[PDB]
Symmetry: C2
Subunit: 255 residues, 2 copies
């Protein structure tokens, strides 16, 4: 009982119109197999430009965030409806930068994901513990709590878990170059599988993709991709470089 | 010592690609005098589409929000650099929906504005009190506190106030249809002028535009626009309708 590999590239708050056009063009020009999901997430104002430049039949474009309300009086926010109207089907939710730096609570992330999922979108739901929480030996407690908030919102509607791609990114690995070792990563993904089996369904744990993120790059992704419970990567800085295409190849050849 | 009128249309989280194209086209097709600043603020993902559809030489496009950091690891956020790279020069900051519903603090709004201003952008800085604060007779205290946070960030760099357009929108008037009377609005703008004179400069208070927002529409904007300290309007719901063009005409003929 395995899985369709997944690699997402989160551009974060980076890029100019020319960078988006050129970089998306370079990615789209790369041979992308039909056996692996490849998604890139440019900043909101760059979405249209990225879509126009994406000449690939496999590459999909995603948003880095979405609000938990539909269209209405939510100045500065983006609705699921807007993303779907633009032809987008993927969206990142709960990235630790929003959780830890911008105050996005466990419940808000969960509500954003639920709304996106109910409308038919695929959600890259991020979870991860800080250096201090790990030092306090609370790694699994935290990751599970974040996943539980989502479980509370979906709960019964298990089927909605089908369009969820969990992205484990230890906060101490985000933008620090301090990537997790295959053992550290696999150990956490194992704990996440177990939680899914118990709180969701044994069958579902076998199908849901769980990707690793946090300093993942061309020279370290192969060893990570060889781990049974690591279905791919959520790439940050490296997704802005040509090595992102190499990571795609490595992921394909590995699983 | 007077001012160049200003009318901004905040679309908030509304619109589809077709709506943006058609609505922006209809606005752009309207005769816009060179004597009044007219700006519309579509949602972030619609910016490019709006720019493409804006065939007017006078109409300017603005963003509804911006982050307080430059390009970097800020997932889901937009930088000033991105907005300027797109040719945008206006941005709304501190809208009460973000302050009151999304937790944007007085200091965060102030820091966002300062960064935008330092880079050369024009900022529509929103302020406003809630029904309870007004009932508690704390209307001016609150509005002044929000303005003071900005004053703390700019403080000395007074000159930066040149590109600031203050938008007073009583929270109880936002999306409720309960517009402020000309007396209520003028009274607050008078108090804001006085604060500016004391904490900024007598000269500057004479030049800075202070616009009214909150249920402003085609049938009530004339009486508001006739008030000496009301230089224009920040239009919400009405900016999504053809009456927005009427408001432009009314503002022009009035001052």
């Amino acid at each position: 009982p395995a899985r369709r590999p997944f690699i997402g590239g989160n551009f974060k708050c980076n890029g100019s119109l020319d960078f988006i056009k050129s970089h998306v063009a370079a990615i789209a020009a790369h041979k992308i197999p039909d056996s692996v999901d490849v998604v890139i997430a440019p900043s909101a104002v760059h979405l249209s430009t990225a879509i126009a430049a994406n000449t690939s039949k496999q590459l999909r474009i995603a948003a880095q965030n979405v609000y938990l309300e539909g269209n209405g009086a939510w100045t500065g926010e983006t609705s699921v409806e807007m993303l779907q109207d633009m032809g987008l089907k993927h969206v990142i939710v709960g990235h630790s930068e929003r959780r830890r730096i911008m105050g996005e609570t466990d419940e808000q992330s969960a509500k954003k994901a639920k709304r996106a999922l109910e409308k038919g979108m695929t959600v890259i739901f991020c979870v991860g513990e800080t250096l201090d929480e790990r030092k306090a030996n609370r790694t699994m407690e935290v990751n599970i709590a974040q996943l539980e908030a989502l479980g509370k919102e979906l709960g019964e509607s298990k089927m909605l878990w089908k369009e969820v791609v969990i992205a484990y990114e230890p906060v101490w690995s985000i933008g620090t170059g301090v990537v997790a070792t295959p053992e550290q990563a696999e150990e956490v993904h194992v704990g996440l599988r177990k939680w899914f089996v118990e709180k969701v369904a044994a069958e579902g744990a076998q199908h849901i993709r769980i990707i690793y993120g946090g300093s993942a790059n061309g020279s370290n992704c192969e060893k990570l991709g060889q781990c049974p419970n690591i279905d791919g990567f959520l790439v940050g800085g490296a997704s802005l470089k040509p090595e992102f295409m190499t990571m795609i190849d490595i992921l394909t050849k590995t699983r």
